[PDB]
DNA sequence: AGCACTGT
DNA sequence: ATCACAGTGCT
């Protein structure tokens, strides 16, 4: 804990998740360059998930499918289901629940996104350590594990699986010889458990995933990306100095945006490791007490954000953009789409209440007007008393109708480029 | 409470 | 003209 080695934390991330879901359903897509796309009409659809075969051609997320086909002519495409005029992600939310439920059998999980979850293995590691007590850890228990930073020094060596094994052997040889620390043993056992977790996910869903194992959430997530796909990486406390010495600051979670850019600009540094030069007080003065404290500890491999026990989303939301000439202008238009959104929301809320024994109590309504730089022009709350689509849509209209700045009966102005309904403030029931 | 930021 | 979500922190 003084060196931030009290916990064993893992981050599991499903490999090209939406693709895997579609590839499981359509075997003709397996082991092929493939992507998942929503809305075929505009340039073949926007790509939101890309198999690794397709990545090898340069296909990326946030790319029009027509442009993707220019890079990858044999690219196959699965379409997001469309329901009530909009993209419907239910299939991937259900697939995500399959996975989370398996992970819960092993430990406390924090659902971080639709396709990844943090795991706190600290207690499971102790449990496992007293079983087989004193018995050595065989390389056969870690068949897909990389040890970041290894192999090193002097004493297969040209291909990747050979590299992995050498690094693992070096790690395990130093373990059983007492040349490593107690937290290093714990991470190793954590990694044995994460192998079993990943094998169970694949056996029971067909989905492959990658994992990071380390002492905190940031290092776990960083480690998870070092060896994708279908592999897991152990980032020990001792590997942090070399790992961070050339790690771009933007690669650390929460520094990929404006804050990270201002750390680079204000301090004149490029890599996470350079942050160790500064005093905590110096970092607090530039970035605030909380950010400074977090940065001072994080650049040394230390962070204390806990794995929250939260397997379910906190909100259930429903949105649609209306770009360009499709922006909503008549009142009958806003009311029709508000109803479409409200109807999908009701279905999902009803399923939620039956599955998870809880009810939302607040309806958040957000819109965007044509010509606003910000992603949201107005957010407004109202009570959510019944799971009734028509009420929610009327209430959503009631709380935005004052945005219309026009006189004509059947006209809305300025036109709306975005509607968003969100149920929140869940309570047991 | 409304908003900005950050992430998948 | 990507888009559809979702969580956290500030004031
Ligand atoms: N609509 C939309 N969906 C997204 C976006 N980013 C991700 N998703 C959806 C699609 C993704 O399938 C899922 C998980 O996102 P990741 O873990 O960041 N990428 P993946 O799991 O696909 O591949 P790997 O993890 O091996 O890099 O969330 C986005 O910008 N937009
Ligand atoms: Mg993923
Ligand atoms: Mg992910």
Author numbering: 1 to 155, 159 to 432
Quote the study on this structure.
We show here that human Polη can efficiently bypass AraC embedded in a DNA template strand by incorporating cognate G as well as noncognate deoxynucleotides (predominantly an A) opposite the lesion. In both AraC-containing ternary complexes, Polη encircles the template–primer with its palm (residues 1–13 and 90–238), fingers (residues 17–87), thumb (residues 241–301) domains as well as the PAD (polymerase associated domain; residues 319–432). The palm domain carries the catalytic residues Asp13, Asp115, and Glu116, while the fingers domain lies above the templating AraC base. The thumb and the PAD grasp the template–primer DNA duplex at opposite sides, from the minor and major groove surfaces, respectively.
We crystalized the human Polη catalytic core (residues 1 to 432) with a template-primer 12/8-mer (5′–CAT(AraC)ACAGTGCT–3′/5′–AGCACTGT–3′) and non-reactive dGTP analog dGMPNPP. We refined this cognate ternary complex structure with the G opposite the AraC template residue to 2.4 Å resolution and to Rfree of 21.4% and Rwork of 17.7%. The AraC base pairs with the G base of incoming dGMPNPP with the expectant Watson-Crick (W-C) geometry. However, the C1′- C1′ distance across the base pair is ~10.71 Ả, as compared to 10.5 Ả for an ideal W-C base pair. Also, the AraC base is tilted by ~30°, which negatively impacts its stacking with the adjacent bases on the template strand. The AraC sugar assumes the C1′-exo conformation rather than the C2′-endo conformation observed in Polη structures with unmodified DNA. C1′-exo is one of the preferred sugar conformations for arabinonucleosides, and it appears to be further stabilized in the Polη active by a hydrogen bond between the “extra” 2′-OH on the AraC sugar and the main chain amide of Asn324 of the polymerase. Also, in contrast to the unmodified structures, the side chain of Gln38 forms a hydrogen bond with the O2 atom of the AraC base instead of the O4′ atom the sugar, and Arg61 (unique to Polη) adopts a single rotameric conformation to stabilize the binding of the incoming nucleotide rather than multiple conformations. Importantly, the 3′-OH of the primer terminus is at the reaction-ready distance of 3.41 Ả from the α-P atom of dGMPNPP. Thus, despite local adjustments in how AraC is accommodated in the Polη active site, the polymerase is well poised for the incorporation of G opposite template AraC.
